[PDB]
From a paper:
The structure was consistent with the resting structures of the human and pufferfish channels previously determined at lower (3.5 to 3.6 Å) resolution (root mean square deviation = 0.8 Å). In the resting conformation, a trimeric bundle of tightly packed TM2 helices surrounds the axis of symmetry. The TM1 helices are found at the periphery of the TMD, where they pair with TM2 helices from the same subunit. The helices do not form an ion conduction pore in this configuration—not only is the central axis, along which the pore resides in the activated channel, too narrow for ion conduction but also the arrangement of the helices does not create an aqueous chamber that is sequestered from the lipid environment through which ions could pass. Changes within the TMD draw one’s attention to a hydrophobic region of TM2 that forms the narrowest constriction in the resting structure (amino acids 308 to 315) and dilates sufficiently for ion permeation in the activated conformation, suggesting that it operates as a variable constriction or “gate” that permits or prevents the passage of ions when open or closed. Furthermore, the reactivity patterns support the structural observation that the hydrophobic seal made by the Gly312, Leu315, and Ala316 residues of the TM2 helices in the resting structure prevents ion conduction through the channel and thereby functions as a “gate” in a manner of speaking. In the resting conformation, the residues are too far apart to interact with one another. At neutral resting pH, the acidic amino acids do not interact with one another and no ion permeation path through the membrane exists. That we do not observe modifications of the residues by MTSES at neutral pH, at which the compound would have greater reactivity for exposed cysteine residues, is an additional indication that the residues are buried in the resting conformation.
The [name] [name] ([name]/PAC) permeates anions across cellular membranes in response to acidification, thereby enhancing acid-induced cell death and regulating endocytosis. Most, if not all, mammalian cells express a [name] in their plasma membrane and in endosomes. This channel, named the acid-sensitive outwardly rectifying ([name]) channel or proton-activated chloride (PAC) channel, was recently found to be assembled from [name] proteins. Electrophysiological studies indicate that the ion pore is closed at neutral resting pH and begins to activate at pH ~6.0, with half-maximal activation (pH50) of ~5.3 (5, 7, 10, 11), but the mechanisms for pH sensing and for the gating of the ion pore are not defined. Structural comparisons show that both [name] and ASIC channels assemble as trimers of subunits, both channels contain two transmembrane (TM) helices per subunit, and both have a large extracellular domain (ECD) that contains a prominent core region composed primarily of β sheets.
Numbering used by the authors:
A (entry chain C), B (entry chain B), C (entry chain A): 65 to 334
Write the structure that this text describes.
Amino acid sequence: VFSVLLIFIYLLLMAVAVFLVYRTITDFREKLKHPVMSVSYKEVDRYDAPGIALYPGQAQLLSCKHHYEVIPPLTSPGQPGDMNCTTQRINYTDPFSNQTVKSALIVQGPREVKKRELVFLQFRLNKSSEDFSAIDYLLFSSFQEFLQSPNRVGFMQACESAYSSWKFSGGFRTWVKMSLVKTKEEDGREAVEFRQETSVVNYIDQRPAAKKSAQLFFVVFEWKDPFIQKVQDIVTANPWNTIALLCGAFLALFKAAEFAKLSIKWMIKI
Amino acid sequence: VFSVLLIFIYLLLMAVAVFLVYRTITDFREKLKHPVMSVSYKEVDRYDAPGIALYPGQAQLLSCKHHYEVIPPLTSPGQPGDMNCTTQRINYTDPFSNQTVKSALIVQGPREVKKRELVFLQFRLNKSSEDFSAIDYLLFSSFQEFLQSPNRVGFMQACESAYSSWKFSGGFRTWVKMSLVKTKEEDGREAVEFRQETSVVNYIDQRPAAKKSAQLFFVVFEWKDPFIQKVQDIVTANPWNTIALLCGAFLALFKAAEFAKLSIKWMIKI
Amino acid sequence: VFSVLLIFIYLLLMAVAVFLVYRTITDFREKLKHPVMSVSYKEVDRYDAPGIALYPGQAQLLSCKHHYEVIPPLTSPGQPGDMNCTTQRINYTDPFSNQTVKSALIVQGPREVKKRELVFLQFRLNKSSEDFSAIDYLLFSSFQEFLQSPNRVGFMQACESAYSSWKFSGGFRTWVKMSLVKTKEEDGREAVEFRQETSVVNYIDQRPAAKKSAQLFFVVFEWKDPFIQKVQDIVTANPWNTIALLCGAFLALFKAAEFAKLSIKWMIKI
Ligand SMILES: *[C@@H]1O[C@H](CO)[C@@H](O)[C@H](O)[C@H]1NC(C)=O
Ligand SMILES: *[C@@H]1O[C@H](CO)[C@@H](O)[C@H](O)[C@H]1NC(C)=O
Ligand SMILES: *[C@@H]1O[C@H](CO)[C@@H](O)[C@H](O)[C@H]1NC(C)=O
Ligand SMILES: *[C@@H]1O[C@H](CO)[C@@H](O)[C@H](O)[C@H]1NC(C)=O
Ligand SMILES: *[C@@H]1O[C@H](CO)[C@@H](O)[C@H](O)[C@H]1NC(C)=O
Ligand SMILES: *[C@@H]1O[C@H](CO)[C@@H](O)[C@H](O)[C@H]1NC(C)=O
Ligand SMILES: *[C@@H]1O[C@H](CO)[C@@H](O)[C@H](O)[C@H]1NC(C)=O
Ligand SMILES: *[C@@H]1O[C@H](CO)[C@@H](O)[C@H](O)[C@H]1NC(C)=O
Ligand SMILES: *[C@@H]1O[C@H](CO)[C@@H](O)[C@H](O)[C@H]1NC(C)=O
Ligand SMILES: *[C@@H]1O[C@H](CO)[C@@H](O)[C@H](O)[C@H]1NC(C)=O
Ligand SMILES: *[C@@H]1O[C@H](CO)[C@@H](O)[C@H](O)[C@H]1NC(C)=O
Ligand SMILES: *[C@@H]1O[C@H](CO)[C@@H](O)[C@H](O)[C@H]1NC(C)=O
């Protein structure tokens, strides 16, 4: 009889609708689980002067100077002189140890990325009773933000956790190219971080044998390129799109069901 | 006449429907071609002890010891002593050469990433007739998995292809920070790999001139951060979503066609 | 009265439709703002011979030779001999300085990635009055494309801007593993770039004290793996999908409105 076939068609269509609802729910759940990553790049005419927190310890800073695209040859390596850059010395308790006080030398970083500005730092360590001598350094976004802060100690403690710290060793020239990566936390706040490319070059020590005891650290900081990399977690689970899909599919199924009923009626009539 | 205009409207709507079907098919084909990448991060309280397969050759292991956040100064570099770590020596044929047998020293890696655990290894090579002396090392996920295996040789041969191997040279201290990246192969299997950040520091050789002939390798392994990076290939080509779009568009086109016919009839009647 | 309730229902449904249109427009605008990144990998049986533009300056090239998976020990470091590779010397004005003419030594790179082909280069610098001695190098895709070009000078000037240049220093062996990353610019053009992993190994100088003045550069170029990484910016803003969603939702809303009117009529009648 036609009635049983029509009822079976209705049941099949309702089962298809239920399965489609299940599939849409599972897809929405899956897309909530895994947001997709999108990467863009931002051109900058001038970077904001980064803060370079150096942790020399007993290593005295011989020289710190800004250069453009090239470093003039050293007049006399291992000798103090030519310190033209803004520096701030800070003492702050380590956020993790709570016992070791860190003394940091904050140096204002380069700004003209287009002009290939670099900052060159020369340190000397004299008679260190410790093999594997290296200087720690941390990079943060703004030196001015460090200056115009009410709690510089708290700012440095926050930097200890927000940013990563690297090292540069003596007997080398360490060339550091910096890059800014800003990650959107889809909450109105963006986390900025530094990615640094390091190249070490041997230092040709032409000092007298007596002066070989003191060891020299050379480090250069510049920007890799005038591109800030922005990383955003795009959500592909839109409830309105899902409900629009469901509504359209339900309307299609209802229209198909009533077309089937009309076709059955037409077959019965003729 | 109104009939010709209505038939032309029907033909235009059917052509639009066909073009929309073509566009949807092309979009589904394109989305099948290029799945989108999604990156997430996993917090870990404790890492599973990684296996560090070292290939020293004739270089004897002076020392291997676990430290926390800092390495105590060497009592006497170049002298054996203080070997507290679990190691396993293995001999296995190279999967690619089929002739060169590799002898590997498997070392259990650090676990407490939160406590900044590191493993410090000191090797000595005495009178090597080969310039550019370096030790190969490979990283795999679990030392325990290596232990509780029926074919350790086959496990090492599989590691030779699954993981990448790096080198650390003498006259340096090589600081290696490890990171785990798990890539989903959308097939029920996930491929795990190691990404390592390497920083070399000069070793200040304060040995007697006689002892300068033997060269020393210092390497440190720890974890960069308590974050495992998961990378998944999300497919954006859902056949059910595409068929729902097509059904909704077809219903819209049919309803618009019958509205147009009704409007033509209303214009004719009045 | 039922009429006021029905009119209020119609107004509510039209407001819902307007809000849904607003949401769809905002979603389309957002998806236009941020295309999603998709990463794939391409297997290669043989790479196209890359061009390695070396900038030695006064450093003479002692040796340049192709090896497979291993470098034979040096017969006599610091001595010329065994130069078997195709090289081209070029002079071109620096695109940025417009005054400094760069002299480049273009070397044909390795091809058999499967066979682990590498190219080994040995340079010597004799009595350089400049500390921090290093040689610049740039990588571009094809040496043949450099050969079969009408303006080699213009090709090199374009490479100065299209590709990135690194350095390798004396007193080391610099192991460079190359990788090709092709980014689709969604405009019919793809930008190819080189990513290089560098490992430095100490050179054990066993030369006489007289010969220690001349400094030696050792560099190796090979391919990291037979995988070319393709990065594409997929656009998730399809106007046809959006209009299909809107049409389906509008049909659903109209059908719901007429169902509501019919239900009100049925309630009034009985
Ligand atoms: C340091 O640099 C500033 C930059 O304007 C310059 O005015 C000053 O003379 C420099 N210092 C010395 C000692 O020359
Ligand atoms: C910071 O610490 C150093 C030693 O670590 C000390 O010489 C210096 O006086 C301290 N600074 C202040 C402001 O107390
Ligand atoms: C470390 O110091 C902080 C700040 O003074 C304070 O919460 C407490 O003394 C310590 N916190 C710990 C041990 O978690
Ligand atoms: C190293 O020499 C510098 C030069 O003045 C001096 O200030 C410093 O106290 C010396 N340190 C040691 C440990 O000799
Ligand atoms: C090695 O470390 C274990 C850790 O518990 C310790 O018990 C043992 O005494 C150490 N070995 C020596 C020789 O002290
Ligand atoms: C592994 O090889 C080394 C030499 O490469 C050899 O001394 C050692 O005995 C071998 N191990 C076994 C278990 O045969
Ligand atoms: C290499 O050794 C394997 C395992 O013994 C075996 O398949 C065969 O001898 C070689 N395979 C090659 C050459 O493909
Ligand atoms: C190097 O010295 C160690 C110290 O005992 C010794 O075991 C080894 O055989 C020596 N090797 C050579 C090549 O002299
Ligand atoms: C350089 O390599 C080619 C490769 O076929 C070889 O024919 C030639 O003999 C080599 N040069 C010398 C001097 O052996
Ligand atoms: C390229 O420049 C070098 C010096 O930088 C010079 O010796 C050489 O002759 C120049 N080449 C040509 C073709 O002029
Ligand atoms: C640099 O040289 C180019 C090419 O000869 C020419 O446009 C002009 O002389 C300079 N361009 C500048 C300074 O922008
Ligand atoms: C260095 O030695 C090489 C060897 O022939 C010679 O060609 C070159 O002119 C020398 N340079 C200097 C600056 O002595």
